[PDB]
Design a protein around this ligand. Sequence first.
Ligand SMILES: Nc1ncnc2c1ncn2[C@@H]1O[C@H](COP(=O)(O)OP(=O)(O)OP(=O)(O)O)[C@@H](O)[C@H]1O
Ligand SMILES: Nc1ncnc2c1ncn2[C@@H]1O[C@H](COP(=O)(O)OP(=O)(O)OP(=O)(O)O)[C@@H](O)[C@H]1O
Ligand SMILES: Nc1ncnc2c1ncn2[C@@H]1O[C@H](COP(=O)(O)OP(=O)(O)O)[C@@H](O)[C@H]1O
Ligand SMILES: Nc1ncnc2c1ncn2[C@@H]1O[C@H](COP(=O)(O)OP(=O)(O)O)[C@@H](O)[C@H]1O
Ligand SMILES: [Mg+2]
Ligand SMILES: [Mg+2]
Lengths: 502, 502
Amino acid sequence: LGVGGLDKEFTKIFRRAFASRIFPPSVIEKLGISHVKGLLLYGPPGTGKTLIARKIGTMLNAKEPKIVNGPEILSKYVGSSEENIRNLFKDAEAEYRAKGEESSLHIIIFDELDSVFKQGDNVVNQLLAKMDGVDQLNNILVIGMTNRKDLIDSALLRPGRFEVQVEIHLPDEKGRLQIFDIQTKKMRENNMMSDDVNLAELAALTKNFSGAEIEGLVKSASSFAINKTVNNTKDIAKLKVTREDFLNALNDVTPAFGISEEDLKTCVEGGMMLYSERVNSILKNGARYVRQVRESDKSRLVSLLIHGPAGSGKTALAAEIALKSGFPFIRLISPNELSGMSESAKIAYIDNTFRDAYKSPLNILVIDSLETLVDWVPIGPRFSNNILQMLKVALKRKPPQDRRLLIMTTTSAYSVLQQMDILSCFDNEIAVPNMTNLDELNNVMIESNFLDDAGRVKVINELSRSCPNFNVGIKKTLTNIETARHDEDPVNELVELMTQSA
Amino acid sequence: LGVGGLDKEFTKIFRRAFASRIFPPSVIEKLGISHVKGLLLYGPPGTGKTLIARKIGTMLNAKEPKIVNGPEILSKYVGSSEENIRNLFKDAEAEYRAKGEESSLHIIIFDELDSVFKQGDNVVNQLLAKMDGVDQLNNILVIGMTNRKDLIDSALLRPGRFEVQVEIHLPDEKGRLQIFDIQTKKMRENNMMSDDVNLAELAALTKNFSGAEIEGLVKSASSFAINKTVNNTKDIAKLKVTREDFLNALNDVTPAFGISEEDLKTCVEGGMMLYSERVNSILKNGARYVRQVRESDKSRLVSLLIHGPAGSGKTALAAEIALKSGFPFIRLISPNELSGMSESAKIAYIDNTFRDAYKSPLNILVIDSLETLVDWVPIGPRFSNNILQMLKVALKRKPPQDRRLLIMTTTSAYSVLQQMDILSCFDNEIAVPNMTNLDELNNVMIESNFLDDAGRVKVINELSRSCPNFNVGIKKTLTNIETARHDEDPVNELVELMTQSA
Ligand SMILES: Nc1ncnc2c1ncn2[C@@H]1O[C@H](COP(=O)(O)OP(=O)(O)OP(=O)(O)O)[C@@H](O)[C@H]1O
Ligand SMILES: Nc1ncnc2c1ncn2[C@@H]1O[C@H](COP(=O)(O)OP(=O)(O)OP(=O)(O)O)[C@@H](O)[C@H]1O
Ligand SMILES: Nc1ncnc2c1ncn2[C@@H]1O[C@H](COP(=O)(O)OP(=O)(O)O)[C@@H](O)[C@H]1O
Ligand SMILES: Nc1ncnc2c1ncn2[C@@H]1O[C@H](COP(=O)(O)OP(=O)(O)O)[C@@H](O)[C@H]1O
Ligand SMILES: [Mg+2]
Ligand SMILES: [Mg+2]
């Protein structure tokens, strides 16, 4: 018909909101019931709600549905906004007086309803008067659409007002396979598509797209082919799209609910070298925890804590573990996102990230430098309590309806966290120590291409008796080598720096 | 065509935004796609965005693009602002009814979009109504322009609304070389430009100029030549713009993203003498770091801490290191800039400086008297936490897209910084001591030309057993010597002053 991926939500709507309209009024009045005048649809944007609303009416051959926007009403002058509501229902009032109860069905669509409640009341009262009060009108059917159900006051959900509610979900694999066919029907119908394109492969490559994203993907793929000929020319009739066009167009559309690849990849990883036996164990534990949350239905929430001294390599390990998992959804919260905001904005952003995290089969969240997010300074001590409470409540909530996520958080102030008494929110703890032997330094120098062995041996020979038990991190060790490489006497300068660092 | 240095951006814009308009409607209807209606361009000011818009306008032979300014509408009265937006789309609406889908293209330009969000809702809602609502027009194409992308909320970036986004960068060598030719074509083609002028040299001398600065440079150069034939005619046949005029004009136009030469040179430096080996060591270390930052891909962020007793001479060393580097971009933040402002003003100033720092291939930043910027007083103790957190966050963020900068900060309260546990933000530390030996005093005496060798040795021979172990800084020594110079008996005054100094 034009819709795809919605089959158990199409029957439920039709059974209740439209089944009684088909039969003649005689039998309906014989039973002694009344028609429904409300319907609510909620879900993420770009999923196909207005499409359902417009497509359903075609079966009943009703009038073209009118459309109104909440912010449109809010932004106008007070008097005009007050007057518009009565103007909206004029034709329905006229038709009822004209033709009694045998009038045709009229549909009114109200979009972005929640905006009215976000702070207005005149609009709500006038709207409810036409459908519940003694001015009851028996021709209308109102459709409501919101992205947040929890903001709608319970007064509107009692019987007689918006009596039926439905939810729309992101499409699954079969939904995407159907949507691709629906979108490319006309293109295929005119022999303008190559025969080497397989829609099954595309159904799997596009992993977490919504309905709207596929349209843009197809449009970009078509544009790729169109631009191939211009500069207006002959033989346009031989135009054809190809698999390579789709593959290249896949690089221009980045979906929401996707991977923030740029940050995790560049900002967080500038090398990775195995210099000790502890790193392998840490990575193996990370891989095991990743596997546990993909093949088990008794664990839908796992949280960790990676602590240690400063400049040890926590964030790089967390990012490395996250990158190799392969989950569709990955995000991180770090101080760089929250710089320059006010407290309320920070709370709103933190809440919104978690709220968006509850709409995918699998998810991963990273929380970097927890002690900085709270503005901790030991002189007072001074810190923000509201953010701490929000994080404490959030780190233990379970996602709804058989969904699962994995949280990894880093810190360097273990004692401070122990004082605040929020150490019971975590399921396990991992420690990252410093370097404490010359063999690890030798491995690091070898793997960084410092210089030939003849020069490498001398540094260790001198440091053996100059400083036996140095205790330095990896981040500073990788910085000393870089600056010593540029000196005129690298061998002595590296030892001089390392002695001070210890 | 008229624009130089933006080939790839031009190709990307043309492929997506305008390609679909060339083909006849039949094939486009055959494919089953729709034309795009949005395009966003962002970058630094004075780079050639509206020039690109105008130049693209002529190829399709569309109507002359309208231009509207954000502040103009925003500041105007409420009623007039609400009413005047409808005036903009009148012609496009009329043409649609007149000629169906065969109508010509109409381009509308919206300038300074972000200004609407900096606080307006009615304008945005009305604008979106014409391109996303049921009253959509198929002839329009809206161009947006902004300098800060972060301020635009995500709601406007989803498919259907502004859908394609592009960035504009400052020109490089070849860009300036092409722009010079484009600007001086008319002078060259009329035998009004001397043959001794070489454009390649000017392309390399101007190191961080944008498009408009070159226009200004050419205008100043032409004015220089024009002014030499007044106090009058008969020179209107042998009028040429020689090379000297351009070199003189180079000293008249100062670009943004340049060097604040006066502040670094005059106020901060008032002498530099080598009275010890440690000074040479410090200078050599500074040079080593400077040349490290320039020739590496692993290190794109280096921060140092220079500390010592009060009056040791810290700021002069940092200024001397900065001046000898030769980088295109240099700036400093000191209490003098933030005097007389409120807290929010200081935060905004720091944020703007750091944001500006991230738009050049190479950069340097100086921060002077860190403990003073926070308003530290030890009686309470009382200090500002917001500025401290902002600075702590800002000292770790890395520049985007393969760029690099070097930060140098000075302080005299090392213990206080240790108490605030912000010593992990720095990669290396350098300590500057005072003077504690007589040979250094003799060296400064020699360098400052205080007196002949006789009195110079006499003063040392007296202070050898008058006071062997004084402890004084350079700043106070060079103020005592100066006041001793202008007395009638320098030796007796200066020996007593220096003995008291200890
Ligand atoms: N095996 C390794 N483990 C960890 N880090 C490594 C390893 N090999 C190389 N590195 C480098 O170590 C550097 C450590 O930087 P990183 O951002 O992880 O520090 P950090 O511990 O988060 O610092 P801070 O505590 O100051 O926030 C990374 O840039 C990475 O390139
Ligand atoms: N080799 C030198 N090193 C440092 N300062 C020198 C040297 N030769 C001369 N000077 C003079 O030392 C003076 C003191 O330096 P400066 O003005 O930077 O003081 P400061 O350490 O920043 O002061 P304060 O601690 O009060 O902030 C400078 O005016 C400079 O002219
Ligand atoms: N489930 C779906 N099946 C087919 N097409 C869809 C679906 N969802 C969205 N689309 C396409 O996306 C376009 C935009 O949908 P839209 O009206 O924005 O839905 P909503 O606004 O309710 O999210 C429509 O023209 C439609 O063709
Ligand atoms: N890439 C370029 N090539 C040639 N001239 C340029 C370029 N960019 C800017 N200019 C010149 O700078 C002048 C001002 O540019 P302007 O239209 O103000 O750009 P913007 O509106 O983006 O600041 C123009 O008259 C133009 O001649
Ligand atoms: Mg970290
Ligand atoms: Mg100073």
